Design a protein around this ligand. Structure first.
Ligand SMILES: CCCCCCCCCC(=O)O[C@H](COC(=O)CCCCCCCC)COP(=O)(O)OC[C@@H](O)CO
Ligand SMILES: CCCCCCCCCC(=O)O[C@H](COC(=O)CCCCCCCC)COP(=O)(O)OC[C@@H](O)CO
Ligand SMILES: Fc1ccc(C(OCCN2CCN(CCCc3ccccc3)CC2)c2ccc(F)cc2)cc1
Ligand SMILES: Fc1ccc(C(OCCN2CCN(CCCc3ccccc3)CC2)c2ccc(F)cc2)cc1
Ligand SMILES: CC(C)CCC[C@@H](C)[C@H]1CC[C@H]2[C@@H]3CC=C4C[C@@H](O)CC[C@]4(C)[C@H]3CC[C@]12C
Ligand SMILES: CC(C)CCC[C@@H](C)[C@H]1CC[C@H]2[C@@H]3CC=C4C[C@@H](O)CC[C@]4(C)[C@H]3CC[C@]12C
Ligand SMILES: CC(C)CCC[C@@H](C)[C@H]1CC[C@H]2[C@@H]3CC=C4C[C@@H](O)CC[C@]4(C)[C@H]3CC[C@]12C
Ligand SMILES: CC(C)CCC[C@@H](C)[C@H]1CC[C@H]2[C@@H]3CC=C4C[C@@H](O)CC[C@]4(C)[C@H]3CC[C@]12C
Ligand SMILES: CC(C)CCC[C@@H](C)[C@H]1CC[C@H]2[C@@H]3CC=C4C[C@@H](O)CC[C@]4(C)[C@H]3CC[C@]12C
Ligand SMILES: CC(C)CCC[C@@H](C)[C@H]1CC[C@H]2[C@@H]3CC=C4C[C@@H](O)CC[C@]4(C)[C@H]3CC[C@]12C
Ligand SMILES: CC(C)CCC[C@@H](C)[C@H]1CC[C@H]2[C@@H]3CC=C4C[C@@H](O)CC[C@]4(C)[C@H]3CC[C@]12C
Ligand SMILES: CC(C)CCC[C@@H](C)[C@H]1CC[C@H]2[C@@H]3CC=C4C[C@@H](O)CC[C@]4(C)[C@H]3CC[C@]12C
Ligand SMILES: CC(C)CCC[C@@H](C)[C@H]1CC[C@H]2[C@@H]3CC=C4C[C@@H](O)CC[C@]4(C)[C@H]3CC[C@]12C
Ligand SMILES: CC(C)CCC[C@@H](C)[C@H]1CC[C@H]2[C@@H]3CC=C4C[C@@H](O)CC[C@]4(C)[C@H]3CC[C@]12C
Ligand SMILES: CC(C)CCC[C@@H](C)[C@H]1CC[C@H]2[C@@H]3CC=C4C[C@@H](O)CC[C@]4(C)[C@H]3CC[C@]12C
Ligand SMILES: CC(C)CCC[C@@H](C)[C@H]1CC[C@H]2[C@@H]3CC=C4C[C@@H](O)CC[C@]4(C)[C@H]3CC[C@]12C
Ligand SMILES: CC(C)CCC[C@@H](C)[C@H]1CC[C@H]2[C@@H]3CC=C4C[C@@H](O)CC[C@]4(C)[C@H]3CC[C@]12C
Ligand SMILES: CC(C)CCC[C@@H](C)[C@H]1CC[C@H]2[C@@H]3CC=C4C[C@@H](O)CC[C@]4(C)[C@H]3CC[C@]12C
Lengths: 562, 562
């Protein structure tokens, strides 16, 4: 197998893997929806007890097995159907992650102008209900009209109408035809993606070089700008005020878990595919610690900047912080452009920011496509030779199925995918992974593999998390997601029940791949129930132990190792 | 390869292969839409000059090459991308052919009653605009209300509302959710289909035994009943009156060509897959002659019976024959039930008729699925071993993509598929087949293969048709289909332009597989333009002639063989 170059394997190169479109695009609106401040505690908790242990586990498993997402379950076949699951999950993510890049690409085409289109009203897409904060002298409708989401701001008008053209659709039932601008943007995105995958894993490149310094620089500039804005202090106070009533709810914990899994990459097969090309002496412990710490710091500073910009916009518009902006996937494309417009030389900063989030999106999607391709090629060796045609077909299918999110009402389908395709499905997938690694495979064998790879055994904390803490918390979040499910709703649009049923069906498409595979493995195995179960719960390299009637899983000492 | 049993290879067993769901379901409404009588002349012409020559050609090619639909182009690789085309075409057919069986299945569940649901009004699905011919004494709205399609008859009300529930949808944009009755019907259909394919080709069975006597018996009974009905004579006169103004149009010729290709099976890969399991001495000439003759006779008698029933219904309803019934895929499910209701013991005859058309549908769909599976297995030998899982996946995908036609507005999608998926696409496919066989491969080699298989060379007529007549007529019908395309319309519902664009895109999906494949073959071949073209236009067993610089296609004597 291939090996990552020394440029990407450097000690200071973990910062590149510690930022993602999720940390800059998903975290902001996920924290704003949960109030802010009350979301950091569940986020940090799931990071320290669930996110980082699963991160370390997936890294060690991918480094030891040298396999893809699904084939890494060569130690326990009954669980190979869960690998496919996360693979599909990753694919589902692409079905809308690439649509996001296209958005930024359009913003890039909107960034090479002296007057930014989101600065003021008066354009073609601007509706009569467009109130610019600097045009209070005219008072067409006033800076403050109503407080539900305030979608009448120039940035919101440019995003919903000038980019997505949501005004030409009333729901998910009448999305219509895809916009040709977004069509060309997604075409360029998938073209750049194809020629960035087709020759296998890229050990090092400009993509992984610019995503390590540009995101941090942009975030620092945005923080320095926001801390000196009028009204920004109010947003800071709203971000450092923890409402424990929100903690009493279950949605906050689900959002925190999903954001942790998106930022760290657990539950998509990216970590295993990445570790499959690492060295045998790579210290996954230090990598996991640094990744978790940098991700937590980045999320904290990003939420702080987002709330500062929200307070600034609330002061400029004379609206409440909870109703000044939306709570959808387009929150950053409304807060960040207006913040850049206030800085001196808005054109240059906007261009830099759009190049940055476009690069971050491309690296995030590449990683996902490479994980999917690596898994399917380790499953089918024909792909290891037909890489070019396989990547072409994967990108073409992703483009075809993403044509839905570049439609006039495509934001609804994008929210549906971001809520159901990678919602309870990824939680069930990582729960099955933890159960198959800590209970079926056993924590002792995993600790021995870690000791023979990195030279030390994990402490009691890591093993107790892998075996007891993380599986229990994953089961708990799955239960509170299934029982306490809330109907999916947009800023003001309410999804019909059939949309929720379609979302649940999409989630079950990935969820039931674990049971379906156990059935397939049981029927395809020749022998009695004992032999079938033994072949299903034992590694492929120890199937001879089935003949010797010596199975560790059939002993009480295996399940009580701890 | 497998061989068909002597039961299906009998001389009198061609009658089973001479009837299809198309001859009993598609021909009737295709002839009624074109007026009747003016449709028989183009039908017979395309049968004698285009249908039968292509039938014989495909039979001989499948018997000589012993390959599937796509692999049969081992004599000319540049044309293998057209095989896939017809394969996809066949799959497209299934996407709605199976939905038809389900319909009949529902009618079966409606046939085990003393009072047929389509006899009179007064049920739940019956709308207030339901006029029964026997209830003229009450005169709710009169036997004659308006003359566009007269969808107010009890049979039409039971079909559109009681079965399809079209009243709960206004177009193709608001089809809604699939009916659970049609859902269970399609589930039973695909279950019967899976266990009828999973063990490979069935040499002989009850399915191919009952479809040889029951269709002819049912048609004879229907003819004897219709020739003794009031008003039936008027329909006979309307069927034997040829309107040459219709012949001046182009739609009639296109419909005749499509119906010929549906009835004979040319353009789907079924003929090649069938001949791949025949004997080396099987006389395809006699088979083609008998098939064409029996198909023509069956189409004639079916149209006669359909027009007799139409005249009877027009007399009973006091409406015009051109407006007494619809012109869609549900014409037979309105004419035949009312005709059975008039016969003594309507329950038994209805049960027999529904068992017959359900069996005919199952045999027609089986043939198609077996052709697709045989082609894809000759392309990928892994399927020759994984037949079970491959058939399961194919049936599951067909069920998923047919869930669209069992929706409230699923008849619109079914008409769209029946008009565009197997419209100009199959014409272009058979044109490319004729060009690749008669011009690229050469009529002399094909005649020599026929002579070495059956012991005689084809006459001048067959070769002139394969080389000049049939390709020219196929090009002509393709031209009149593309240039003189008419917007697709239902009985009263008009499809929006985007529906026509989606239909054209679906057709192009199959059409452009020929060009895309020539590009793929050209890039995957290593060598200069001369060597690439030689490897692309020469059989796989003669590629050594490329090294000797002796290619027949590069000589004028090859293209001027005649
Ligand atoms: C939403 C309902 C889908 C039900 C469709 C259910 C088929 C189940 C076959 C199955 O499970 O076989 C796999 C290999 O097959 C695959 O690719 C992935 C199959 C997963 C299909 C999910 C597609 C979802 C869009 C397992 O094969 P294997 O025995 O582990 O290895 C065979 C070879 O791939 C490598 O050895
Ligand atoms: C609507 C746009 C689709 C563009 C998608 C374009 C890929 C083109 C690959 C291609 O053309 O490779 C084929 C084998 O691949 C296949 O299966 C069928 C491929 C056709 C895909 C059509 C799917 C339509 C729903 C030819 O492979 P081969 O070199 O003849 O033989 C390889 C092996 O199958 C047997 O030798
Ligand atoms: F094989 C690999 C090759 C490259 C990478 C890179 O990672 C990309 C960074 N994110 C990717 C996926 N994120 C969340 C998943 C969302 C998603 C999106 C689209 C489709 C499916 C899922 C987590 C991390 C990388 C970048 C710097 C680096 F130093 C090392 C690796 C990973 C694996
Ligand atoms: F491999 C084979 C095995 C069996 C058959 C049987 O033919 C079925 C009879 N029709 C099938 C297809 N029709 C039109 C296509 C429409 C269609 C429908 C669904 C999906 C795709 C396309 C033409 C003929 C058969 C029956 C009696 C017999 F004696 C011999 C063969 C054929 C090939
Ligand atoms: C085709 C294969 C790859 C699977 C595709 C899975 C995803 C992309 C599918 C599964 C169910 C689909 C949805 C089903 C129904 C609707 C409602 C319609 O008014 C707009 C499209 C929309 C919202 C679809 C979008 C795409 C969708 C989410
Ligand atoms: C199976 C997947 C991977 C590939 C094939 C996907 C095809 C069938 C899907 C993907 C997205 C779809 C499009 C999405 C939205 C619209 C706009 C609507 O007003 C007409 C149909 C149209 C134009 C769809 C046509 C079919 C389409 C192109
Ligand atoms: C091959 C099949 C399965 C999928 C085809 C996908 C592609 C070719 C189709 C699907 C939806 C289509 C788009 C639907 C609507 C519009 C808006 C209008 O400006 C015409 C072009 C444009 C932008 C179409 C371009 C082609 C398109 C992107
Ligand atoms: C609708 C569009 C955007 C879908 C994506 C199409 C992409 C994946 C396709 C379109 C044309 C293709 C190219 C056509 C020909 C060649 C030359 C060959 O020697 C290597 C592959 C290469 C370079 C192909 C790569 C994939 C490709 C770029
Ligand atoms: C020789 C051994 C390794 C068998 C190789 C078979 C491989 C090439 C086959 C078997 C399973 C196949 C996959 C099964 C299902 C799907 C989903 C579909 O939406 C796109 C094609 C795709 C992704 C197939 C691609 C080809 C595939 C990977
Ligand atoms: C659903 C839409 C997006 C179309 C997707 C088409 C994909 C799944 C198809 C199209 C062409 C196919 C390839 C054609 C030929 C080969 C060579 C064979 O030795 C291994 C499989 C491989 C490499 C196929 C893999 C699957 C493939 C890439
Ligand atoms: C209910 C449907 C829609 C989803 C689940 C279907 C599963 C349970 C079925 C569908 C097709 C089945 C396979 C069909 C044929 C074979 C070959 C033989 O070795 C027996 C097992 C095996 C490999 C089956 C395993 C179970 C299977 C994969
Ligand atoms: C998914 C893969 C197998 C390809 C599927 C091809 C066929 C079945 C697809 C291609 C384009 C599709 C159509 C695109 C758009 C619409 C309009 C919508 O209001 C109802 C469904 C309907 C009418 C779709 C029905 C299914 C369809 C005809
Ligand atoms: C790629 C193909 C072969 C397999 C996957 C097809 C899936 C994605 C398609 C096929 C038919 C589709 C369904 C057709 C119609 C409806 C009714 C509508 O009110 C909600 C969506 C719903 C319920 C669709 C959901 C998605 C669906 C199930
Ligand atoms: C796995 C994904 C890709 C496809 C899922 C397809 C199946 C499971 C889905 C697609 C559309 C669904 C149907 C849509 C609507 C109805 C009507 C109502 O009575 C509820 C059940 C019923 C009848 C659903 C049953 C399940 C269904 C048939
Ligand atoms: C929604 C439904 C109707 C889709 C179709 C599902 C069909 C194809 C699936 C569902 C369950 C499957 C069966 C499950 C298990 C077995 C036992 C095995 O020893 C042979 C295959 C066999 C007999 C499978 C055949 C295919 C099968 C019947
Ligand atoms: C070892 C050699 C023969 C290669 C074998 C690869 C075979 C098994 C692969 C390569 C091409 C693949 C097909 C490519 C595309 C599609 C269309 C998709 O909608 C369903 C899966 C399907 C139909 C794939 C099934 C598996 C497939 C046939
Ligand atoms: C799109 C919807 C309907 C799902 C379709 C799934 C189909 C294409 C998939 C699901 C499971 C797949 C099979 C899984 C495993 C194998 C064994 C391998 O050695 C050859 C390919 C083969 C036989 C695959 C062929 C394609 C397959 C049947
Ligand atoms: C424009 C798009 C959407 C449709 C047509 C794409 C065609 C022309 C492209 C897409 C991917 C391409 C393939 C990608 C890679 C290879 C491998 C190498 O041997 C060169 C040719 C070959 C085999 C290409 C042939 C042409 C190809 C099949």
């Amino acid at each position: 197998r291939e090996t990552w170059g020394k440029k990407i394997d450097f000690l200071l190169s973990v910062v590149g893997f510690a930022v993602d479109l999720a940390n800059v695009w998903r975290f902001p609106y996920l924290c704003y929806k949960n109030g802010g401040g009350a979301f950091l505690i569940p986020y940090t908790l799931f990071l320290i007890i669930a996110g980082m242990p699963l991160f370390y586990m997936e890294l060690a498993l991918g480094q030891y097995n040298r396999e893809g997402a699904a084939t890494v379950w060569k130690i326990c076949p009954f669980f190979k159907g869960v690998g496919y699951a996360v693979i599909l999950i990753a694919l589902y993510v692409g079905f809308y992650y690439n649509v996001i890049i296209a958005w930024s690409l359009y913003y890039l085409f909107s960034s090479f102008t002296l007057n930014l289109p989101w600065t003021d009203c008066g354009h073609t897409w601007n509706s009569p209900n467009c109130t610019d904060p600097k045009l209070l002298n005219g008072s067409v409708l006033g800076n403050h009209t109503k407080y539900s989401k305030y979608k009448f701001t120039p940035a919101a008008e440019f995003y919903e109408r000038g980019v997505l053209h949501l005004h030409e659709s009333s729901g998910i039932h009448d999305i219509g035809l895809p916009q040709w601008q977004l069509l060309l943007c997604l075409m360029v995105v998938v073209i750049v993606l194809y020629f960035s995958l087709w020759k296998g894993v890229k050990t090092s490149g400009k993509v992984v070089w610019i995503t390590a310094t540009l995101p941090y620089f942009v975030l620092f500039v945005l923080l320095v700008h926001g801390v000196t804005l009028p009204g920004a202090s109010n947003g800071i106070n709203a971000y450092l005020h923890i409402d424990f009533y929100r903690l009493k709810e279950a949605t906050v914990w689900i959002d925190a878990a999903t954001q942790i899994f998106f930022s760290l990459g657990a539950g998509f097969g990216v970590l295993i595919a990445f570790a499959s090309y690492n060295k045998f002496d790579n210290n996954c412990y230090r990598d996991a610690l640094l990744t978790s710490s940098i991700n937590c710091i980045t999320s904290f500073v990003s939420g702080f900047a987002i709330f500062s910009i929200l307070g600034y916009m609330a002061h400029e518009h004379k609206v409440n912080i909870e109703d000044v902006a939306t709570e959808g996937a387009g929150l950053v494309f409304i807060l960040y452009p207006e913040a850049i417009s206030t800085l001196s030389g808005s054109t240059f900063w906007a261009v830099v920011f759009f190049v940055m989030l476009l690069a971050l999106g491309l690296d995030s999607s590449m990683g996902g496509m490479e994980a999917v391709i690596t898994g399917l090629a380790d499953d089918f060796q024909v792909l290891k030779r037909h890489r070019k045609l396989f990547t072409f077909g994967v990108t073409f299918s992703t483009f075809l199925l993403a044509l839905f999110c570049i439609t006039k009402g495509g934001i609804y389908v994008l929210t549906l995918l971001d809520t159901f395709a990678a919602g309870t499905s990824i939680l069930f997938a990582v729960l099955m992974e933890a159960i198959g690694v800590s209970w079926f495979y056993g924590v002792d064998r995993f600790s021995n593999d870690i000791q023979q790879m990195m030279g030390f055994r994990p402490g009691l904390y890591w093993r107790l998390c892998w075996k007891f803490v993380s599986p229990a918390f994953l089961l708990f979040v799955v239960v509170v997601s299934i029982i306490n499910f809330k109907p999916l709703t947009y800023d003001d649009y309410i999804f019909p029940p059939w949309a929720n049923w379609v979302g649940w069906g999409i989630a079950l498409s990935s969820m039931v791949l674990v049971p379906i595979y156990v059935i397939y493995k049981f029927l395809s195995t020749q022998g009695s129930l004992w032999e079938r179960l033994a072949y299903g719960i034992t590694p492929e390299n120890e199937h001879h132990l089935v003949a010797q009637r010596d199975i560790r899983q059939f002993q009480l000492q295996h399940w009580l190792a701890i």
